[PDB]
C-alpha cells in the first residue's frame, strides 16, 4: 500500500526545476530536455487548459528550446488548417493580421507573442532554417484553401480547371463552417463528400501533368485532403454519433503526420487531451490524435503534457461567454494535481518514463486529473481519470496559473 505523501517527495527529488515561465528568459533550465526528447521526430506539447497565461508562455519557451536546440522546424497548432495558412504567411513574410485568423479562444497576447517570435526567428539570417506554421484542425474549410487548388491547376494545367472549377464553387459556401454543412440534407452532404473525393481523385490521376513528384503538388494534394476530411466527418450518420469525434481526431492526426512526413521534425501544440498517448477525453472521443500518433510513431513520438494546481483560468461560463471564470480546486489528495502540487517548486518538469518504486506503479494506475474543457457545464466533467505514466512521457507542472490575456 503506497503512501502518496512519499510519492510527492520522490517527485521533488527527481523534478527538474524551471526558473520562470517568461518567454524571453534564458533557456538554460530546459537543457535536461535535450536527452529526454532524444531523436524523436514529433513531439506533442499539450496544454492543461486553453485559458491559462503561464501554460501558454511555458509552452512558448519549450518550442523556443526545441527549435534552436533540437532541430524542430514545424509547429502544428490545434487550429484550423485554413486559418493557419494565414499565420504561416505572417511568420514567413511578416504580412497579415494574425489575431484576425486565430480562433476566438486563442485570440490572446501570448499566442501573438509566440507568432511574433517565430516571425523574428525566420527573418534572422543567422538561423539556417525556418519554422513553418500548420493547422491540423478542420472546423471549417475557408476559400483560401480552395484558391490554392484553383491557382495551382490554372498555372500548371489550366485545361483541367473545368473538371474542378464549380465542384469547388459549390463546396465553398457549405464548408465555411460546420453548422452550414451539418444543416444540410443527408443526400446533400453525401454529394459534397463525392465532390471532394472527385477533386482529390482528379489531382491524383493528372499527377504527371501537374508536376506531381514535386513538393508543391504535395501541398495541393493535402489541401484537397482537408476538404474530404471536413465533408466526411460531417456526413456522419445519426446511428453512429461517436464517429464525428473519431473522424475529427483521425484527421488532426493525419494532418500532424503529413507535416512530419513531408516537412520534418514537428511540434504538435494542442490540448492535453489531443496529444496524450491515452484517451482522457473518452467522454466524447472514441480515440484521440495522440493515440494514432503513438500507434504509428512508437518511440518516434514523444508526448509532453502540462499540469496545474492552483489559480484561475479563462473558460466559457454558464452563459457561454469566455472569461476568467475558472478557479482551480485541487482538493482531492488522490489526484495528480494535488500530489504534483505538493512539490515545493513554482514550475518544474520530469521524465515520467524514468520513475521507480511505488511512484512508477502509481503513475500507471488511473487517478483523477483536471480535465480542462473549454466549457463549464452540468454535463461537462471538471476532472477525468487517467494513467499519467501512460498518457505522457514528460510532465511539466506549473503550481500557479492566471488567465490568458485575451484580446479586448
Nearer to Ca ion, 271 or 277 (CB): 271
CB of 139 to Ca ion, least distance (A): 10
CB of 254 to Ca ion, least distance (A): 17
**Cα(279)–Cα(291) distance, integer angstroms:** 7
Q: What's the grid cell of residue 126? A: 543567422
Nearer to Ca ion, 61 or 271 (CB): 271
| Residue entry with cell 533540437 | 70
Alpha-carbon Rg of the chain, whole angstroms?
Answer: 22
Nearer to Ca ion, 79 or 254 (CB): 79
Site for Ca ion in 199-228 (CB under 5 A): none
Asked if residue 234 lies in contact with residue 244, where contact means CB atoms within 8 angstroms, the answer is yes
Nearer to Ca ion, 239 or 379 (CB): 379
- Size of site (CB under 5 A) for Ca ion: 1
| Residue entry with cell 501537374 | 210
CB of 373 to Ca ion, least distance (A): 9
CB of 80 to Ca ion, least distance (A): 12
Tell me the backbone φ, ψ of residue 253, rounded to 5 degrees.
-60, -50
> Could you tell me which stretch among 2-10, 26-34, 237-245, 263-271 binds Ca ion (CB under 5 A)?
263-271
Three-class DSSP category at 298: helix
Q: Are strands 347-351 and 16-18 parallel, antiparallel or unpaired?
A: antiparallel
**Cα(14)–Cα(66) distance, integer angstroms:** 22
188 is in an annotated binding site: no
What are the residues whose beta carbons fall under 8 Å from the beta carbon of 173, sequence distance 6 or more? 180
Q: What's the grid cell of residue 202? A: 482528379
Nearer to Ca ion, 139 or 317 (CB): 139
228 is in an annotated binding site: no
CB of 219 to Ca ion, least distance (A): 25
CB of 372 to Ca ion, least distance (A): 9
| Residue entry with cell 494546481 | 309
Cα separation values, 404 from 55, 109, 315, 334, Å: 9, 8, 10, 28
CB of 75 to Ca ion, least distance (A): 16
Nearer to Ca ion, 271 or 367 (CB): 271
Nearer to Ca ion, 305 or 389 (CB): 305
Tell me the backbone φ, ψ of residue 194, rounded to 5 degrees.
-75, -35
- CA 9 from centre of chain: 32
What are the residues whose beta carbons fall under 8 Å from the beta carbon of 305, sequence distance 6 or more? 44, 46, 48, 272, 275, 276, 391, 392, 394, 395, 396
**Cα(392)–Cα(379) distance, integer angstroms:** 26
**Site map for Ca ion, 265-304, x if CB under 5 A?**
------x---------------------------------
CB of 240 to Ca ion, least distance (A): 23
Residue nearest to Ca ion (CB): 271
CB of 271 to Ca ion, least distance (A): 4
Nearer to Ca ion, 257 or 271 (CB): 271
Three-class DSSP category at 331: coil
Q: What's the grid cell of residue 359? A: 511512484
Three-class DSSP category at 53: helix
Nearer to Ca ion, 60 or 248 (CB): 248
Asked if residue 401 lies in contact with residue 58, where contact means CB atoms within 8 angstroms, the answer is no
List binding-site positions for Ca(2+). 50, 78
Residues in contact with Ca ion by the rule CB under 5 A: 271
List binding-site positions. 50, 78
Amino acid at each position: 500500500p503506497y503512501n502518496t505523501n512519499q510519492i510527492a517527495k520522490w517527485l521533488e527529488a527527481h523534478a527538474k526545476p524551471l526558473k520562470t515561465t517568461n518567454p524571453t528568459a534564458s533557456l538554460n533550465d530546459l537543457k535536461p530536455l535535450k536527452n529526454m526528447v532524444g531523436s524523436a521526430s514529433i513531439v506533442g506539447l499539450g496544454e492543461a487548459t486553453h485559458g491559462a497565461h503561464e501554460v501558454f508562455t511555458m509552452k512558448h519557451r519549450i518550442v523556443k528550446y526545441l527549435v534552436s536546440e533540437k532541430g524542430f522546424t514545424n509547429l502544428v497548432l490545434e487550429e484550423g488548417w485554413d486559418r493557419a495558412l494565414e499565420l504561416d504567411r505572417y511568420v514567413l513574410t511578416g504580412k497579415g493580421n494574425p489575431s484576425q485568423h486565430l480562433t476566438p479562444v486563442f485570440k490572446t497576447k501570448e499566442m501573438l507573442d509566440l507568432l511574433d517570435w517565430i516571425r523574428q526567428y525566420n527573418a534572422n539570417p543567422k538561423h539556417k532554417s525556418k519554422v513553418r506554421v500548420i493547422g491540423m484542425d478542420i472546423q471549417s474549410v475557408n476559400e483560401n484553401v480552395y484558391n490554392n487548388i484553383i491557382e495551382y491547376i490554372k498555372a500548371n494545367n489550366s485545361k483541367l480547371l473545368p473538371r474542378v472549377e464549380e465542384k469547388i464553387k459549390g463546396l465553398i459556401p457549405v464548408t465555411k463552417d460546420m453548422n452550414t454543412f451539418e444543416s444540410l440534407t443527408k443526400e446533400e452532404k453525401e454529394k459534397y463528400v463525392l465532390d471532394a473525393k472527385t477533386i482529390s481523385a482528379l489531382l491524383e490521376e493528372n499527377k504527371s501533368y501537374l508536376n506531381g513528384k514535386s513538393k508543391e503538388f504535395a501541398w495541393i494534394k493535402q489541401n484537397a485532403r482537408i476538404i474530404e476530411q471536413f465533408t466526411t466527418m460531417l456526413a456522419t450518420p445519426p446511428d453512429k454519433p461517436a464517429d464525428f469525434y473519431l473522424k475529427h481526431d483521425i484527421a488532426m492526426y493525419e494532418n500532424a503526420k503529413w507535416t512530419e512526413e513531408h516537412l520534418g521534425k514537428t511540434i504538435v501544440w494542442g490540448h492535453n487531451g489531443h496529444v496524450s498517448k491515452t484517451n482522457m477525453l473518452s467522454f466524447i472521443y472514441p480515440k484521440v490524435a495522440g493515440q494514432h500518433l503513438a500507434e504509428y510513431y512508437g518511440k518516434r513520438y514523444v508526448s509532453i503534457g502540462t499540469s496545474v494546481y492552483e489559480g484561475q483560468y479563462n473558460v466559457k461560463n454558464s452563459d457561454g461567454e469566455f472569461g476568467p471564470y475558472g478557479t482551480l480546486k485541487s482538493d482531492d489528495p488522490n489526484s495528480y494535481n494535488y500530489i504534483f502540487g505538493q512539490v515545493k517548486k513554482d514550475q518544474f518538469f520530469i521524465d515520467l518514463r524514468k520513475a521507480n518504486g511505488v511512484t512508477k506503479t502509481w503513475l500507471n494506475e488511473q487517478h483523477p486529473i483536471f480535465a480542462g474543457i473549454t466549457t463549464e457545464g452540468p454535463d461537462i466533467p471538471k476532472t477525468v481519470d487517467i494513467s499519467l505514466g501512460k498518457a505522457f512521457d514528460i510532465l511539466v507542472q506549473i503550481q500557479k496559473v492566471s488567465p490568458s490575456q485575451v484580446h479586448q
